């Protein structure tokens, strides 16, 4: 009857990601569901380092470009229909929500 449902959140914006995570945990604590998380995975730092000059003249200066990806994992012990109800709330822009039935 009760299953461990895994919700994964990804975003470049920490504040928006943390806001949605709190809305889900707090939205599940209202239904008295058992909640595991949020678990914060290590931040993925995509990095592109490139020559600033469009030509090859001058001092060789470099731009270090970083695109950070933050990932959260929340496990809810409940039925899929109940979880579908909690996650159906409008989510902040740029936060990618992904609901899967944990294979355990």
């Amino acid at each position: 009857m009760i299953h461990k449902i895994r919700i994964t959140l990804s975003s470049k914006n920490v504040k928006n990601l943390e806001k949605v995570c709190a809305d889900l945990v707090r939205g599940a604590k209202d239904k008295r569901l058992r909640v595991k998380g949020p678990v914060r995975m290590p931040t993925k730092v995509l990095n592109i380092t490139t020559r600033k000059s469009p030509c090859g003249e001058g001092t060789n200066t470099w731009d270090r470009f970083e695109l950070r990806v933050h990932k959260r994992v929340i496990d809810l012990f409940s039925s899929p229909d109940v979880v579908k109800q909690i996650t159906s709330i409008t989510i902040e822009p740029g936060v990618e929500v992904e609901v899967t039935i944990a294979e355990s």
């Binding site: 592109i48 490139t50 469009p54 731009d63 970083e66 695109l67």
Partner: protein, 50 residues
Amino acid sequence: WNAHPKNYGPGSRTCRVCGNPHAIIRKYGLMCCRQCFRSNAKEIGFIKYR
């Protein structure tokens, strides 16, 4: 006409923005030349911190 194989090497790949074959950034599947990437970096989501 265009018979020569184009399965690998610089001749197969080009910049997705401008079409130039040089200095392509293939990391993460960007497929942009280094000049076009710097112009579009902010829009793509890349940022300079240090």
